Amino acid sequence: QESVKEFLAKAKEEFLKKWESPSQNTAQLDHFDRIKTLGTGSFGRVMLVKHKETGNHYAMKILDKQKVVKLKQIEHTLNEKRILQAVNFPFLVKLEFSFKDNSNLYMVMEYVPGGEMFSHLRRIGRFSEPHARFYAAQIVLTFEYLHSLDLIYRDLKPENLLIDQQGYIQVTDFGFAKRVKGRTWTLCGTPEYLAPEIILSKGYNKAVDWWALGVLIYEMAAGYPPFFADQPIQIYEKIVSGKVRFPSHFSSDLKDLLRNLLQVDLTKRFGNLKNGVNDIKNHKWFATTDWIAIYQRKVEAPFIPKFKGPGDTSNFDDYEEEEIRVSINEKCGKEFTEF
Ligand SMILES: CSCC[C@@H](NC(N)=O)C(=O)O
C-alpha cells in the first residue's frame, strides 16, 4: 500500500538524518540522583534515576568502558547508542540523553514502571491467544520499521519487552542491534531465541528476528519456549532440528503461523519471502488485528500493569546497590570517541 510505503520512506529519511549526524553529550551525571538499581550485568547496569531540576524519572544504562573493552563489546555499545538516538517508533523505549565521562558510558532512557513482559507472563502462566496476538502485532510492526531501516534487533525475548502505563509494549535493550545491509556473523542473543543459522555460525540476516518472533509467540501462548531443554547444547540441538511440539490448546491458525516463522530453512521463513512482512500481517492468526489501530494505540490493552506512579519500582527486582565511580583519569577515550 502506498500509504505504508510513504510512511516508511519518511521514517527512513528521519532515521538517516540522525544516523549520519548523531547527537552527543546531551546531559551530565550530576544532573541526576540515583534511586535504585533495576538490573546489572557483566559490563553495566540499569539505574532508576531522577532529574534534579525537572523531577522526571529515567532508566539510566551505565556501561563501564574498561569492561566493555575487555569483553569485546565496543562495537555493540556504539551500535546501541547510535541506533537508539536515531530511531522513533511507538513501541521502542526512547533515548532521552546520552553522555560519557572518564569511566562510563550513559544512556538515559524513558522509565517504564510496568516492568518486563517476562514477569507478567511467569506470574499468570500463559497468555490467551488474543493477549499474545496484541503483543505480537506490536513486535511485527516494530520489526517492519527496524528492518526497513536495515536494522536487525537480535535480542528478542520477554525480558526486553516492557509494558507501559497503557498496557502497550516498549522494546528495550539495543545492545545487539546493528545496521546490516546483507549478512552479519556475530554470535549473540539468548539461547532459547537463537535461529538455527546463528547456532550454525553462518552469515545471517533479518530473518533471525522473524524466527525469534515465532519463539516469542510460542512462549507467550504456551508459557514456555518451543525448544526448551535444561542445557544449552540440548536447546541448540532442538533448534537446528526444528521439530516443535505444539500444545493441543493452540489454535490451528497459531500452529500454522508458528510452523512458518519457526522454519529452519531461512529461505522459506515468513518475513523473509517475496511478500516480506505481509505474509505475517495477512495470516489468518492476525485476521482480527487492525494494524493501524495498534500503531495508533487505539486498541484497549489486555491488561494494565499495577504500579503507583512513575517512581514505583515494585515491578522490578532487587539488586545489591553498588557504587558508580568516575575515575580521575580518562579510560578508553579512543575506543569511544564517537559515543
Ligand atoms: C546518578 S548515578 C551516579 C551517582 C553516583 N556517582 C558519582 N560518581 O557521582 C554518586 O553520586 O555516588
The C-alpha R_g of the chain, in whole angstroms, comes to 20
Instruction: Concatenate the DSSP letters of all residues of 24-86 into one string.
Output: -----GGGEEEEEEEEE-SSEEEEEEEETTT--EEEEEEEEHHHHHHTT-HHHHHHHHHHHTT
**How many angstroms does the Cα of residue 69 sit away from the middle of ligand 1?**
22
Structural domains in the chain, CATH included, are 1-21+116-306 (1.10.510.10), 22-115+307-339 (3.30.200.20)
| Cβ-based neighbour number of residue 334 at 10 Å | 6
The reported resolution of this PDB entry, expressed in Å, is 1.4
Estimate the crossing angle of helix 117-124 against helix 207-222, to 10 degrees: 30
Write the single-letter amino acid at 120. H
In sequence order, the 6+-apart residues with CB closer than 8 A to the CB of 222 are 126, 247, 250
CA distances to 133, 212, 227 from 263, rounded to whole Å, are: 20, 11, 13
Instruction: Output the residue whose Cα is nearest ligand 1's atom 6.
Output: 324
Indicate the top mutation candidate among 29, 48, 100, 107 to test ligand 1's pocket, ranked by most ligand atoms within 8 A of CB: 29
Rounded Cα distance between 225 and 197, Å, is: 18
Binding residues for ATP, as ranges, are 38-46, 61, 110-116, 157-160
Q: Which residues are catalytic?
A: 155
**How many angstroms does the Cα of residue 325 sit away from the middle of ligand 1?**
7
3-class DSSP assignment, residue 98: strand
Atom number, ligand 1, closest to the C-alpha of residue 32 = 1
Which position has the grid cell 516463522?
Answer: 261
Indicate the top mutation candidate among 46, 324, 326, 327 to test ligand 1's pocket, ranked by most ligand atoms within 8 A of CB: 324
Q: Are 48 and 36 in contact (CB under 8 A)?
A: yes
CA distances to 20, 77, 146, 224, 293 from 12, rounded to whole Å, are: 12, 22, 9, 36, 22
CA-nearest of 73, 68, 87 to 19 is: 87
Instruction: Output the residue whose Cα is nearest ligand 1's atom 2.
Output: 34
3-class DSSP assignment, residue 184: strand
* Method used to solve the structure: X-ray
In sequence order, which ranges of the chain are alpha helices (DSSP H)? 2-20, 65-70, 74-84, 117-124, 129-148, 196-199, 207-222, 232-241, 252-261, 278-281, 291-295
Write the single-letter amino acid at 28. Q
321 lines ligand 1 (CB under 6 A): no
Greatest Cα pair distance, the chain, in angstroms, is 62
Rounded Cα distance between 294 and 312, Å, is: 27
Q: What's the DSSP call for residue 94?
A: P
Rounded to the nearest angstrom, the gap between the alpha carbon of residue 10 and the centroid of all alpha carbons in its chain is 22
